[PDB]
Amino acid sequence: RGIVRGGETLKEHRDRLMAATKATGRYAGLKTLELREREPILYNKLFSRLRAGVVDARETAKKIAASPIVEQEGELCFTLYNAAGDSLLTSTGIIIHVGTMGAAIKYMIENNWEANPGVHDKDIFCNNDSLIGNVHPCDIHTIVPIFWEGELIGWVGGVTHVIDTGAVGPGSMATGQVQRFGDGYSITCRKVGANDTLFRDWLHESQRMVRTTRYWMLDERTRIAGCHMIRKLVEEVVAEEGIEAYWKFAYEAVEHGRLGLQARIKAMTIPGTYRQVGFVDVPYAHEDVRVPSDFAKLDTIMHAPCEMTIRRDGTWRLDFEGSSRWGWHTYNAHQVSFTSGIWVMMTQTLIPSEMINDGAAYGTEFRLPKGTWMNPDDRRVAFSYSWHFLVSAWTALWRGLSRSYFGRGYLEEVNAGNANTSNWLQGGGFNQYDEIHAVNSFECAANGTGATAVQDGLSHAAAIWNPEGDMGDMEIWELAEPLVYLGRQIKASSGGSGKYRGGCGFESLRMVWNAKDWTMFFMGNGHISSDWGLMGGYPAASGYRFAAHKTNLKELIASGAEIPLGGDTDPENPTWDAMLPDAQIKRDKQAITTEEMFSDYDLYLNYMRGGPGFGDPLDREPQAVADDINGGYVLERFAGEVYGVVVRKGADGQYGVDETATAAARAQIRKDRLAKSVPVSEWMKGEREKILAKDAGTQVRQMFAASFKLGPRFEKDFRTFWDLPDSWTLPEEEIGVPTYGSRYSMDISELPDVHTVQFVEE
Amino acid sequence: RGIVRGGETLKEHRDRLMAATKATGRYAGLKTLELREREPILYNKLFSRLRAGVVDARETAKKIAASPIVEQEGELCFTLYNAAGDSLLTSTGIIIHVGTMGAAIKYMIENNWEANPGVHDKDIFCNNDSLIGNVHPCDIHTIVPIFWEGELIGWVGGVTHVIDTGAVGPGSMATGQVQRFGDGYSITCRKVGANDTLFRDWLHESQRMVRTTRYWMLDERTRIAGCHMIRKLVEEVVAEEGIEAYWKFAYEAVEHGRLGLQARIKAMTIPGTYRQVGFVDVPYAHEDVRVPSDFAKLDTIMHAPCEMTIRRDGTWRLDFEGSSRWGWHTYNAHQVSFTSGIWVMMTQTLIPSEMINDGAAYGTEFRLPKGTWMNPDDRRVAFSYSWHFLVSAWTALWRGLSRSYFGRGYLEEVNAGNANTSNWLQGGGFNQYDEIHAVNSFECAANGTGATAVQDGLSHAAAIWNPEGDMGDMEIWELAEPLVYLGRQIKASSGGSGKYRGGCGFESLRMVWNAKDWTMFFMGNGHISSDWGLMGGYPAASGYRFAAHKTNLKELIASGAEIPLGGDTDPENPTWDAMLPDAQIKRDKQAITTEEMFSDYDLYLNYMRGGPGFGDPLDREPQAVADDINGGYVLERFAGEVYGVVVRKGADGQYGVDETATAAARAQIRKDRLAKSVPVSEWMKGEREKILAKDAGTQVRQMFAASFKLGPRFEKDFRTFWDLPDSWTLPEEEIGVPTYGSRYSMDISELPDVHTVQFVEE
Ligand SMILES: [Mg+2]
Ligand SMILES: [Mg+2]
Ligand SMILES: [Mg+2]
Ligand SMILES: [Mg+2]
Numbered sequence A, B: 001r002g003i004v005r006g007g008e009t010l011k012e013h014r015d016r017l018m019a020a021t022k023a024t025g026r027y028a029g030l031k032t033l034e035l036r037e038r039e040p041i042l043y044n045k046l047f048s049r050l051r052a053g054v055v056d057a058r059e060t061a062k063k064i065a066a067s068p069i070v071e072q073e074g075e076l077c078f079t080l081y082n083a084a085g086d087s088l089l090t091s092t093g094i095i096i097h098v099g100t101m102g103a104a105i106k107y108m109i110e111n112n113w114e115a116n117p118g119v120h121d122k123d124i125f126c127n128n129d130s131l132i133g134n135v136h137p138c139d140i141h142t143i144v145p146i147f148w149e150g151e152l153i154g155w156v157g158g159v160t161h162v163i164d165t166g167a168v169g170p171g172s173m174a175t176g177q178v179q180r181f182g183d184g185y186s187i188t189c190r191k192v193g194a195n196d197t198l199f200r201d202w203l204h205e206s207q208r209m210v211r212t213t214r215y216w217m218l219d220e221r222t223r224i225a226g227c228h229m230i231r232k233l234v235e236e237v238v239a240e241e242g243i244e245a246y247w248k249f250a251y252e253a254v255e256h257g258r259l260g261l262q263a264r265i266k267a268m269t270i271p272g273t274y275r276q277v278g279f280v281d282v283p284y285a286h287e288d289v290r291v292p293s294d295f296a297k298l299d300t301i302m303h304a305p306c307e308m309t310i311r312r313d314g315t316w317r318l319d320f321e322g323s324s325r326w327g328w329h330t331y332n333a334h335q336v337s338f339t340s341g342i343w344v345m346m347t348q349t350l351i352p353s354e355m356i357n358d359g360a361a362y363g364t365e366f367r368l369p370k371g372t373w374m375n376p377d378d379r380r381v382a383f384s385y386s387w388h389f390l391v392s393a394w395t396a397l398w399r400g401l402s403r404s405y406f407g408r409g410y411l412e413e414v415n416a417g418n419a420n421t422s423n424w425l426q427g428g429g430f431n432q433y434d435e436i437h438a439v440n441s442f443e444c445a446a447n448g449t450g451a452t453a454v455q456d457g458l459s460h461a462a463a464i465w466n467p468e469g470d471m472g473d474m475e476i477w478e479l480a481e482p483l484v485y486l487g488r489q490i491k492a493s494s495g496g497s498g499k500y501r502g503g504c505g506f507e508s509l510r511m512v513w514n515a516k517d518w519t520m521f522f523m524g525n526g527h528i529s530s531d532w533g534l535m536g537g538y539p540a541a542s543g544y545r546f547a548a549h550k551t552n553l554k555e556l557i558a559s560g561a562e563i564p565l566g567g568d569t570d571p572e573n574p575t576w577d578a579m580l581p582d583a584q585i586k587r588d589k590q591a592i593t594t595e596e597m598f599s600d601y602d603l604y605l606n607y608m609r610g611g612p613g614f615g616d617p618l619d620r621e622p623q624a625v626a627d628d629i630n631g632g633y634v635l636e637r638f639a640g641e642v643y644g645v646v647v648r649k650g651a652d653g654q655y656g657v658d659e660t661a662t663a664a665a666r667a668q669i670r671k672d673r674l675a676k677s678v679p680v681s682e683w684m685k686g687e688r689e690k691i692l693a694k695d696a697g698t699q700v701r702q703m704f705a706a707s708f709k710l711g712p713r714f715e716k717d718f719r720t721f722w723d724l725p726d727s728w729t730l731p732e733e734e735i736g737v738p739t740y741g742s743r744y745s746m747d748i749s750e751l752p753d754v755h756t757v758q759f760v761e762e
């Protein structure tokens, strides 16, 4: 007898539901929704109680944690699933894991966990394996089955982002390793407890494979608390309303979700084809990236083109033909994490007032060619900072959707896109309590947001992976890091220029304090801004590094000399560097590094990115430019060149607008634009000559060569666009950089007894 | 009710036995051995059946394996334990794990595995955790409890050396990582099966955390087979002879072992104090050691002094006060692996014809100060190539014991010591079967042995960790590595010079063939020979690297040009290098590297070390020098300078002795030695001046500074010996190299619910 209510096995149950979905186009073959249509009062009561239950689990259980990432920032999520692993309802927070935890349940279904090791009432499962769909090892899942009268009726999943998982690099978004081997403690749907009790062998092992043991332990108790709170609530709801009504809701709620997406697409968008692209930099050639494998030492660029099709029937399709290959770094991903993040974006714009569950995934088609960075075909890839690529590809999809909104008149919904979510301040060694430790600041939960068609973006406000941004309290971060704040400031000229300006980021200056045997490193975008502005707007600023060693600050503090405080207001004209005549200063574009020794009184700049702009900056309201200068959002010297606005300082020290001189400056910039530009055909003629001569850096050529091999339709498009002869070719081997993994790869499904679950066309 | 036969818990049972051992000086308080004394025929029958059973398990189960390390070389072991985790009998092979697997059982005892996760009939445990005593992660243990009528009566352990465990570096003895984080998949006494059946979550997880998956899987079936063969045999023996007799044997056999050691010490040795020391090099400053942490980039030297005391009552004591600190590399150890290796040495010299079990450990006292490399006090240390330090410290103990043998007249037992067991040929990528792979050659199972007081050492014959040496067949290694042999040759002038010559090593030249996306690296002693000669003999030769890239060998082979074959006969006067005019050749002292790209037709020299010599070379039989030159054991040019023997080539091409010219050369060398030497006081005066001026390299100064801090008795000895003033000091911080971990450390016993087992004074 199978364990699901009614007697099917888990696999029999899911296979029946997936076949009916495929045959009918409706989730589970549900052509009507009987509970919703015939018993609307009961449908709403179950919705209300269960949604309040999952929200309450997150709000309450987070008070268990010692880590501020969980306890203050709220980087956790609890989700309720039906027997087939499809989500019905969720808390807010890090909701990408609605998809990752469901995909882990489906892996158990498909690989016969029911027969061995068994799925029993009061069991506890733990999982973080990115090969079966997770974002990265630091997002740990606890999964508990739910039983009613001896049969399985659902599951509950809880996730927390933990500080570290014992990777080569000390942090969550770690560098140093270039493969799975060294990428952190990785757990594949392990049974870690039974009879509601954790096994001691699991406890002893797990706790010694991480740096931040005590923080790890309390994050685990946080996840188990919320899972058991939700299990208890489901048992009470079933006792009170009856299993038949709950059993109907558990599948109807998903189809209701799909219906909600379809309706919102037809109400808000326009049918058609939308084309867009994103990129980001991987500067691994630099000497301060000390990786232990020579085949990883090269500069590469991520490529993510998307063809987006909205159909007349309210279905839609996203095709990533042309994308670049996985690589020897920690930025690779998986079909589940990639597509779950697109679902997260949908929750922030298309479906925020519909059912928030897996229904909307069933209403979207995805094509991710096998072997690309978003659907890799090699079981050795590393994932610790998956986000570097993920957040840089998702931002372009906001631009496509915004063209539909703009065309139709829903200007309030337009958003030029998400910021790159970085820098991530990281490091390890001994802390102020004389214990082994690591740090990973979540200040980059609070980056700038994209401008709209109606108003400026928000500064220091959000991240694509959690719109409820929070930078945390300085006094709380000081309890969890051997560092002290010397500044926290809004980041001038970081927001993307436009008629409406993208949100600025912010910055903090840290001094090392009460640390021993300590190291730190940087992780974020450097040479490339991943976001683009929309309809005339510009990208946000890109990244850079500031650090200072052997500062002599102990003596400078004691003698009453000037000391660096605040932010690095104008990095082209800095004030701090001249105050530290004896220091070794690193001030450059190298926004990715591996761990380097730091001591007490050394300095580290944490810089959070801005978001992209909207519209021609020459149309910005002149008073808004003056307000931005007075408020620290824009440096005075760009008012003239970027916006054509002339400002002058009044008697009170405040800048005001010269309206006559501004009109003249803007008339003159219109003429300058015509004088400096050329017809696009003429510029194309010169660029085509460079392509024929192979005149670009190795990082540009490697990106095109790898993209061409994985995406023949893209190669054909490029050749046609640039009118290239068949005698021109770009083999990756002729560039002169290492190309390990370009031809030979071994997928996880090649190992014995492994059955992978397919979610996309590939 | 406790699970041990009679109703004691595991912990109650062991604690009672250890208290009686301490109170009486006899294992388990056994003042007489009733079964042995009153029923000698039955005692011998149990011995015979059970020893044959464990020998048969090793011989038979190894035929399961795909890895030649297990199947041909026999790098596996099976051991039978009593309920308290003390060994009764063992197969031969890698018998250091008699101690490591017993210490893992004792960890389970001491940490209440009985209450959670429980210890049940037909359970399967797996373990490799070096923090609780194991050599390194590549030695995997399977441990099965043995029950009789529902109560526990013993355990069986089986170990195999596996090819890799998914460390940063591709190999068993890996470099690249500098901490536990990246040192390989580490398993802490995990329950991996029940009802004789392995759990699917364990199978899926374990198999994706290693490169050599198929080899891993068959090594696991090998261990479970032998464990279950032995469990069945114990059940049959108990059924036939009765539980009462078996229960007596299970403790008497251990005390019989202790009695055997005591008697052998009093029959073979001399009471007194013996003083000796060993060293080895860690050249991590070199650019070809690409580690990901800057605090690890420095040159250091391992220091292992030993004060050995043999008492009038036949007890003995080994004290390692003065030893150097753990470091940021893969060469650290643990009190269990260090002391178990001394027990292995004992089995090869003192007790080979006594009971081979834990009894001899109870008859030996060890002192390893906490924080030294052999008893570290930090839970972050790495262990993948523990042996580098271990084999370099154990060799000196042969010299001490040999002075007792020599003095008493047991010249047949003298041995100048064990070779350094290296090089380890390692690497990874795609193999000839187009799968992900790693290699780790066990050619260094067959190194030279130390000379005796009666005869030469054996060439290419053994290792300290397994005296049954085997180099493997070339045709078998070619099935498991994408490499082909171009040479296999005895290594001339590697054996340590003496009246009796130490065994030579051997060498093999490899060409890369049918590999893709391939890397390789070197691991062994370079600047320092760890072994010393005895009573006038010399150390074996030290290590070096030869590798060649971009060789052009495809064209050289095809054109009929000379190609490198055989061994690198005289590395001072090489022949291969001139044959490869277009190659990039690396020929130097850097015997430790991290992974480097290699391609088909590139070359790698695998060089196995020799063993130390005995006596003044001027007393060697002249014909034996001529035989050595003719046989390829010694290069011609050293006959005159080292041995004072004059040889000449006859008409037949063979070297022969000039007996008259040899007598004259030896008389003249005696005079040369007197003329070139100085009185030891005079030499001491000049060396003391250098010490006072701090004139030595950073690696020498760091070794003394670290040793002084951990060993105040050693600092006092050094100051007294060299008559140094109190104004002279050597703080580690003044050297100018990184010193992370010199003051701050956190032991595994500081984590919650961890109870460590103590085996030594510290
Ligand atoms: Mg492939
Ligand atoms: Mg498969
Ligand atoms: Mg003289
Ligand atoms: Mg403790």
Ligand SMILES: [Mn+2]
Binding pocket: A135, A136, A138, A139, A161, A162
């Ligand atoms: Mn996370």
Ligand SMILES: [Mn+2]
Binding pocket: B135, B136, B138, B139, B161, B162
């Ligand atoms: Mn081993």
